[PDB]
Every structure is written in C-alpha cells, then in structure tokens.
Amino acid sequence: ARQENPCGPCSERRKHLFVQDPQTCKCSCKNTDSRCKARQLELNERTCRCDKPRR
Numbered sequence: 001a002r003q004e005n006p007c008g009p010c011s012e013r014r015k016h017l018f019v020q021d022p023q024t025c026k027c028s029c030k031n032t033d034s035r036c037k038a039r040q041l042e043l044n045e046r047t048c049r050c051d052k053p054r055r
Contacts, residue, residue, distance in 0.1 A: 017048040 007025035011018055020027045029048035036043045036050035044051045 011046075015047065 007020050009020055010027035017031055018027045018029050031048045033043040039050055041050035042053045
C-alpha cells in the first residue's frame with residue numbers, strides 16, 4: 001500500500017450499471033447495445049439501460 005487514492009466513479013455514483021478500472025479510472029457499462037439488440041431495444045448510454053430502438 002502506497003499513495004492509496006481509489007478511483008471515483010465517472011457518472012456520479014447512481015450509475016451502478018457502470019464498472020470502473022481500479023488504476024486508470026476509465027469506466028465501461030456492464031449493459032451493451034448488443035444485449036439490448038438481442039431484446040429488440042438499444043442502449044441509452046447515459047444510464048446504460050435498454051430503451052426503445054432509435055432506428
């Protein structure tokens with residue numbers, strides 16, 4: 001342990017659907033446009049929830 005400064009979640013906190021890299025703090029969603037498309041939906045990249053297909 002040295003210079004212990006944990007990363008702060010990108011989209012505030014409430015975006016629990018996002019996961020974050022522990023060292024570089026870069027965030028990616030667990031949910032995807034591929035998942036949503038399989039459900040005949042598309043991803044709302046703000047919340048990373050599946051919404052009506054904007055197509």
